[PDB]
């Protein structure tokens, strides 16, 4: 029972200008956190999205989304004048927030061009000489990607698909001017969060980042790096990323992701992997990877397979990655989501490296006793954190209006034997969260949609829902101090402050 935190994504941070940002109310979350007891605060993955607005399939897996960039100090600096579109409130309006903010950040360039002191200048230079190893594919790929109407890079000229020598040089040159737009969202991203991230841990407030173990089949990465991925000569996946049939989906999940060439990543040392922890590090304290078995084995599916069904399973080099790993940090400062249906190797792989795993209470009462999402059955050396529900999971009173009839009774009951009980719906999230800080978890992490008791309209993200994810966004003032309170007084209650 050692700490908890709060799992809140920065776009659901509230605030003008149409989404959360790396800005006031952001430190203001920090004090709440402080004051409220927390000493976590976990995100959802930082990277530049498209398509569907999803954090897990971004453009790149180095960049930094430039939707999350406060304006207001760009506009305090006189670089640009801004003018609302008309945002809604408590939910973000992509569409609206992809035709305003990417004009707005691009005039604020022109700004910057033209009034950027010297130590401004300087600054934005060294940073582009520093980040260039990935920053110069990352702003060319999202430059040509503008330039070409949004279609994906292996849908290119075959010269800058399969990037020709030349052709490379002469866009970089004939639009070296977005290509440093792209550059500078970068530079403004990263100084914001480092800027947060101090904040927070003078606060003694630590981040827990996220990313998923596969990248976005169109990224900068896939299109510079195609020797790490299974692609044929046109750059498409011959195989792509999923999971097999199981008790509850009958054809299994195909999720188009391009798949590693293990192989290849092993004899370069895994150096994209260390990369990518490295850069990650940066920005969190702890890094959560997604889909985690898949450094165990993954489920290989044919790119011609519309389903998972012709799948099969092939083996990864986990043990040799994280190995590696731990050398090259001196720790492994991963942790594993290991939710689904996982089997003892992947638990032996997770376990012989210490690294802590996840326990989710909505999945917890469905069955009898014997449920490993149970508090009674977590692992004596407590060494997992417990959520309520996580981002793809709908709010705990959301969960608990639908649930079967066995899982509210066995919720009830179970409550019970922890001496527990509730009576109003509303009360739901805050009796789970409770039994949750009650338990051997060294670490609970709860989405703030239940500290607030929302319902499924606060829902983060529904898989499977093509529309409406990534949304969800805490009005003005919605959270109070009395919520704030109320955790701590239930932390200290625990021993987890
Ligand atoms: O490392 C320490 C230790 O575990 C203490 O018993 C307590 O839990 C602290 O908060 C911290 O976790
Ligand atoms: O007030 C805002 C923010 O909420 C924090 O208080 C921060 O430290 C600054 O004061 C900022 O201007």
Redesign the pocket.
Known sequence: ???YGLLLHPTSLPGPWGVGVLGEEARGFLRFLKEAGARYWQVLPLGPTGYGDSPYQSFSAFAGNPYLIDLRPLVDRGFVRLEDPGFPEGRVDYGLLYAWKWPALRAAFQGFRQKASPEEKEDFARFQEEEAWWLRDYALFMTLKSHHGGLPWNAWPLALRTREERALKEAEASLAEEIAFHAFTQWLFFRQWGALKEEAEALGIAFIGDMPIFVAEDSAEVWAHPEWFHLDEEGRPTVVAGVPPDYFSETGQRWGNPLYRWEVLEEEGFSFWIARLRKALELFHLVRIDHFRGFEAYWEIPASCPTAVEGRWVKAPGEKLFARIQEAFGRIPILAEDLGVITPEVEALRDRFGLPGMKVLQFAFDNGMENPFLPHNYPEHGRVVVYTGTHDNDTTLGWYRTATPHERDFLKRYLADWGITFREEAEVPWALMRLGMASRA?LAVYPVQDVLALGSEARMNYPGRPSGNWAWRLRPGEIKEEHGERLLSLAEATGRV
């Open positions: 029972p050692c700490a060294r």
